Amino acid sequence: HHSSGLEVLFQGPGSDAPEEEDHVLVLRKSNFAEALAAHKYLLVEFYAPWCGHCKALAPEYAKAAGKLKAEGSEIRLAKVDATEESDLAQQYGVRGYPTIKFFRNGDTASPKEYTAGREADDIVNWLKKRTGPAATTLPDGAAAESLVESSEVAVIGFFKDVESDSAKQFLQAAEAIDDIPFGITSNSDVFSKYQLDKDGVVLFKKFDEGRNNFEGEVTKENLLDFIKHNQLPLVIEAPKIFGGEIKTHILLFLPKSVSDYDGKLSNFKTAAESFKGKILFIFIDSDHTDNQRILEFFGLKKEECPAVRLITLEMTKYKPESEELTAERITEFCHRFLEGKIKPHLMSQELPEDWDKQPVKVLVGKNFEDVAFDEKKNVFVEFYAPWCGHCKQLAPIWDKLGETYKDHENIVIAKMDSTANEVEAVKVHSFPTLKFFPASADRTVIDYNGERTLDGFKKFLESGGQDGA
């Protein structure tokens, strides 16, 4: 009826507004949601006519569509010219072209990004893997083994009736995950192979416990939680890291170029055992330039590593009391942290000789206390990062503010690089962060949450921070 029938309606253009170009569906903001409701498998390309990547890609996109049609496949390809549908494209955060996204069952909340090859054949292939059965049917034990053996991590469901409710939820979760192979079996021999007492699920992996058994009601939600949780090894080398439930991280900085890489690495591994859900153990290669930001964020060079640092994400940083990395010292550090016995680790660049030369004063960890907490001064401080776009957008305004106050008796405008400096009294996780320290108010701090404009700042300052944000 509805799930598959269109009844009498006129919602948008008549002709000759094209509906299809070379088997590719033309979509607009007036025929988008209808397309998604009518096609359970729809790849959509967002392009612009002046983009060279698009101009090049068009004929292969067409070819793949033509081949798909010649096979009477359910899958269809569409396109959206972003220049004429910009709201539509903005809706999916499309910045840059082409941006290709795959929609399953018309759900607009879980599009999968297409990053694969640019030839018609790799398009079709990608789509064929992602369509059809979410798990591979396993006929026997050899198949099961062959599957767990093929991947660092694999997941198998055991269901007597493959069309049953729980089987269908399991398949539901199989669809949501791309980086793990899934398999499914109704063979009771395969149940026995894995010691199952009834319909259930198991995750195999090439490290640690070697395996994890699912417990509880079988639902898409429960399985996604079970997997994303047991998928990572005790010691991980990104997006999954932040996805995590644990807000306490320990980092071993390990140059791939170090002597006895695997031994020291193993000492770390040994210490990870005492904290499973308590603290996340992470190692990283301090040689690879991709990490050089992180290093500087912890105040380390390259010859100072290996080293270990702790960080609570809501947020101070710590390091161990001693320089020795043994399993035992790592463990001891972790425990001394958990007791509140480890005191935070602070860093500061060196105080430049011209810090106070400009109207905006420059602070580092060392003179910060001295200037910001002076009882006689009203100090307005910007905490920023060097590579931050929002900090770059604020720079000219902050300078203007400094300018208008440079001759003030008691008001001082200033800034600190918060990637390079850690201070006791203030903790910054986002950038820029703006904070006011009034005169003759002890150590009161007031946050600036209002407009970032010369105007908002003047109102704020002239009122002593009592009106602003």
Side-chain angles (χ1 to χ4, degrees), residues 42 123 178 181 241:
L42 194 67
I123 282 158
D178 282 61
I241 284 71

Side-chain angles (χ1 to χ4, degrees), residues 2 14 36 66-67 82 99 108 138 179 184 198 244 265 267 269 278 303 308 392 409 423:
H2 269 354
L36 245 52
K67 296 163 132 192
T99 309
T108 59
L138 312 165
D179 42 24
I184 181 158
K198 63 212 173 57
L265 186 57
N267 295 3
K269 183 69 198 66
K278 292 179 298 302
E303 292 291 281
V308 295
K392 289 297 179 33
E409 215 280 346
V423 274

